Amino acid sequence: AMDIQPSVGFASRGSLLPGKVVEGLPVMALNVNNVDVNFFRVKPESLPAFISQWEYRNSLANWQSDKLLQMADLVYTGRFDLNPARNTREKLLLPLGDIKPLQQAGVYLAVMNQAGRYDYSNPATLFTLSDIGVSAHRYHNRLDIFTQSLENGAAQQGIEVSLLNEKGQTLTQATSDAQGHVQLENDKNAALLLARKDGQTTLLDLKL
């Protein structure tokens, strides 16, 4: 790979940890002056099936498919001007603050339209907009979970935490208490947590 090939892609293929619109969406650009991107919101009712499928398909760059996309709704399409320095790879942030649908909580997919002679490294990425922070650790025969507000870090009560296997099947569920705690059994097939409250949703990969 000694040739200077024009290339563009998301800096990463996706992360379940919530972020904010103000953070932007990072792209790696080398001698590319634009990126055409479709944004989708994953349908809440299909989220366990989507995230389960995103987990065993994210092994490669082009993890998007028509079957995966039917579990989401297109919310915005736009062309973003990029001006990286000649022959220098740059990390550029796509601004998200003026895309009205991203004012809403959700699990979003961003997919680049791969038209032209450009090389596409990571054409799809996943990002979550949510105020729910979920963290967990095994402790003997239990899985100890903490649910909080990401704005101020405070423990939050009443957050429904569902334990999912790698297939997206719900193994069990419980709601956080006054101290932001959920204690579940340690299941052989525990793979994901899905935490929900008042339209906010955050997932956690227990295998990471």
16, 108 in Cβ contact below 8 A? no
198 contacts: CB under 8 Å, gap ≥ 6: none
Chain centre distance of CA 3:
33
* Solved with: X-ray
76, 99 in Cβ contact below 8 A? yes
Chain centre distance of CA 82:
23
Resolution in A: 1.6
Chain centre distance of CA 158:
23
Instruction: State the pairing for strand pair 119-120/7-10.
Output: parallel
Q: Using alpha carbons only, how large is the chain's radius of gyration in Å?
A: 18
Q: How many residues does the chain have?
A: 208
DSSP secondary structure letters along the chain:
--S---EEEESSS--SS-B-GGG-EEEEEES--EEEEEEEEEPGGGHHHHHHHHHTTTTSS----HHHHTTEEEEEEEEEE--PPTT--EEEEE--TT-GGGGS-EEEEEEE---SS-EES--EEEEEE-SEEEEEEEETTEEEEEEEETTT--B-SS-EEEEE-TT--EEEEEE--TTSEEEEE--TT--EEEEEETTEEEEEETT-
Q: Is 161 exposed, middle or buried (CB count within 10 Å of its CB: 0-12, 13-18, 19+)?
A: buried
Tokens 């987990």 identify what position?
55
Q: How far apart are CA 50 and CA 152, in angstroms?
A: 30
Nearest alpha-carbon partner for 162 in 106, 104, 202? 202
